[PDB]
Amino acid sequence: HMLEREKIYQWINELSSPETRENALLELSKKRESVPDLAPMLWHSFGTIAALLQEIVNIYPSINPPTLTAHQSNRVCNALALLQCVASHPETRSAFLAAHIPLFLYPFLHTVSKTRPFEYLRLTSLGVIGALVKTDEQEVINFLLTTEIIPLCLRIMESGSELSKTVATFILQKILLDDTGLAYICQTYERFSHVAMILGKMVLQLSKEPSARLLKHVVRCYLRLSDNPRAREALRQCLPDQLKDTTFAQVLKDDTTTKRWLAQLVKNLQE
């Protein structure tokens, strides 16, 4: 079993030298799920994390104006996959969050360029936050709330590719699912409205160009909002017509879980 371990150790060492870092990132990214202890191995040295963070820092000049290549995007995404590995491990998650590592990813979420290198960079960056929200931790929710991730997700939900829209909606859904999260969004009409308006624009687009995967997350967000009494009275007035119609009835005939959620939403809204 030591042949795998010795290969992992060698690649970890190779991240220190910039001459061997690119190949080491590629090899280690392929083992992000195969090796369960990969995250504490990576976190052990400040040097390994500094090297991964250096890869993120190297593409910040490719933002203004947008000049990112597929090669640049692909290499940084290999380093984001190693950070995602550290974000989701039970031994390293708290330390990753105490080190404010997601903040290094926020400049990538702020980008608006629709070229594939930037859109796929946002997809992978969203994936790191996605892995982090999936852990189902109060510390994660508190971090995301104070660092203003909600506006970043809403922008992507409105203008991103189908996959980026799904991850962004999934992040919002997981924040909404938490009691602190739902209370935060429903605290002011402004915050609720930002969410409701974007969800509404998404329903109108899904009625033109369908996506059952995206619709599943959009409906779950609306259903969670219905649990708050103020959001429920607001939705009685602003809920899109397409959700009360037979608009998605054809598609939802094959998606029982979503059809159930939409039924529970109309039931919550009819008092």
Binding site: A70, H71, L80, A81, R116, P117, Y120, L121, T124, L163
Partner: peptide, 25 residues
């Protein structure tokens, strides 16, 4: 199965086509 896809795997697929053609040999 909550997401239904792997964001990193989808990135590698999406960029593979562009990486093979973006640099003029």
């Amino acid at each position: 199965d909550d997401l239904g896809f792997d964001p990193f795997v989808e990135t590698q697929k999406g960029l593979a086509e562009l990486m093979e053609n973006e640099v003029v040999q």
